[PDB]
Amino acid sequence: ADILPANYVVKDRWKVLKKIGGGGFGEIYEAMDLLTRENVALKVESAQQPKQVLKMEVAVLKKLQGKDHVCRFIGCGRNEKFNYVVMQLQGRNLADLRRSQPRGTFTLSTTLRLGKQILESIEAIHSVGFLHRDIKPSNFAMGRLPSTYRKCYMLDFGLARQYTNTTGDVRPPRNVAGFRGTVRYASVNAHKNREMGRHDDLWSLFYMLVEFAVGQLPWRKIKDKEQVGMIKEKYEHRMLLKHMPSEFHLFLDHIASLDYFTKPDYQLIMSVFENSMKERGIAENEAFDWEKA
Ligand SMILES: CC[C@](C)(O)C#Cc1ccc2[nH]c3c(c2c1)-c1nc(N)ncc1CCC3
């Protein structure tokens, strides 16, 4: 039932090596580029799938070309069996890297520097008029080259939504929008099946950085969406910051002030990370936790 078999060649150029990811809505393969001789990510969608999502993912990827923390676009195409996108292959995701740490925690140095890169990638996708809507550690992957191995990349626009109309205006929110993303990092707004905004992506970032620094979130043992939302709705969020830099209160208060319509203050959040690093003498040039150094 895999869409492409091993050694299958796409457009006489991209040869399937193995499947590296799968879901309801498509599959991702590591392929060899028979022209350039590097390996690539080959993402495919069945031609016969009711929800045709990959054309939107490619439109977003193309709008982001030239930004940092974005996979290079290599090509795309469509035939009678599948649609496909070829993109730059990335490496280890942050969820696997965090689980590989002794106590499931990153240092504050690693946490804050990742936070700056993730924030940049979130502002970038927002700047081209899209919400990610499933910001989570497994959707960020470190690079796999000398030129990229300390760079963090945003993956999987499969749940993204355009929040502007054709002429650049904010579009009306639906009175109910079914939240179909991952439970652990979902905002209270997403839990309430409210239309998601730019602020909800920054809620996911907030929850991610607490889990990175502390090793856990209070609801991590609860998989049920409704239960987790009821736990978050009451949870005293300042408690999440007991063992975090005090600047994080400025981040919490700012995102708690936002609504669907309000452009976030990305700079205020960036300065929380930069001030937290400067207070603690954390340098940009520092080793990440997973490096020998
Ligand atoms: C960002 C643009 C797009 C087309 O929406 C996507 C994706 C995607 C969705 C699910 C995925 N799942 C995976 C990857 C991956 C990528 C992946 N991908 C790339 N480029 N290296 C490495 C990996 C890691 C292997 C798993």
Residue nearest to atom 4 of ligand 1 (CA): 57
102 and 246 belong to one structural domain: yes
**Technique used by the depositors:** X-ray
Query: Tokens 């620094």 appear where?
Result: 213
Counting beta carbons within 10 angstroms of the beta carbon of residue 293, is it exposed (0 to 12), middle (13 to 18) or buried (19 or more)?
exposed
Q: Are residues 99 and 198 in the same domain?
A: yes
45 and 161 in a single domain? The answer is no
Mutate which of 14, 16, 19, 28 for ligand 1? The one with the most ligand atoms within 8 Å of its CB, which is: 28
- Supply the CATH number for residue 43's domain: 3.30.200.20
User: 164 and 223 share a domain?
Assistant: yes
Residues 214 and 144 grouped into a single domain? yes
Which tokens in the block code for residue 241?
């910051």
Tell me the binding residues: 20-28, 43
Q: What's the 20 CA to ligand 1 centre distance in angstroms?
A: 9
Task: Say whether both 194 and 209 belong to one domain.
Answer: yes
Nearest CA to ligand 1 atom 12: 21
Edge-to-edge strand ranges of the sheet holding 14-23: 9-10, 14-23, 26-33, 39-46, 82-88, 73-78
Q: Single out the residue in 88, 110, 137 at which a domain terminates.
A: 88
Tell me which residue has its CA closest to atom 8 in ligand 1.
156
Which mutation among 17, 156, 162 tests ligand 1's pocket best, with the greatest number of atoms within 8 A of CB?
Answer: 156
For the chain, what is the domain count? Answer: 2
Other Cβ atoms less than 10 A from the Cβ of 222: the count is 15
User: Domain containing 225: what range?
Assistant: 92-279
- How many angstroms separate the Cα of 266 from the Cα of each of 122, 123, 157, 236? 9, 7, 20, 24
107 shares a domain with 195: yes
Torsion angle, alpha carbons of 193, 96, 274, 118, to 10: -50
Radius of gyration of the chain (CA): 19
Same structural domain for residues 43 and 139?
A: no
CB 70 within 8 A of CB 64: yes
Q: How many angstroms is it from 134 CA to the middle of ligand 1?
A: 13
Annotated binding site for ATP: 20-28, 43
As annotated, the active-site residues are 134
Whether 290 is covered by a domain: the verdict is no
Judgement on whether residues 57 and 106 belong to the same structural domain of the protein:
no
Residue nearest to atom 20 of ligand 1 (CA): 89
- CA 172 / ligand 1 centre spacing (Å): 30
**Position 284 in a domain:** no
Ligand 1 neighbours (beta carbon < 6 A): 20-21, 28, 41, 43, 57, 61, 71, 85, 87-90, 141, 155-158
Q: What's the gap in Å between 262 CA and the centre of ligand 1? A: 30
72 and 145 share one domain = no
> Does residue 293 sit within a domain?
no
Please count the CA atoms within 13 angstroms of the CA of 106 that sit on its side-chain side. Answer: 26
Asked if residue 199 lies in contact with residue 135, where contact means CB atoms within 8 angstroms, the answer is: no
What CA–CA distance (Å, rounded) separates 28 from 240? 35
Task: Please say which residue of 88, 119, 153 terminates a domain.
Answer: 88
Give 30 Cα–ligand 1 centroid separation in angstroms: 10
Rounded Cα gap, residues 271 and 293, in angstroms: 27
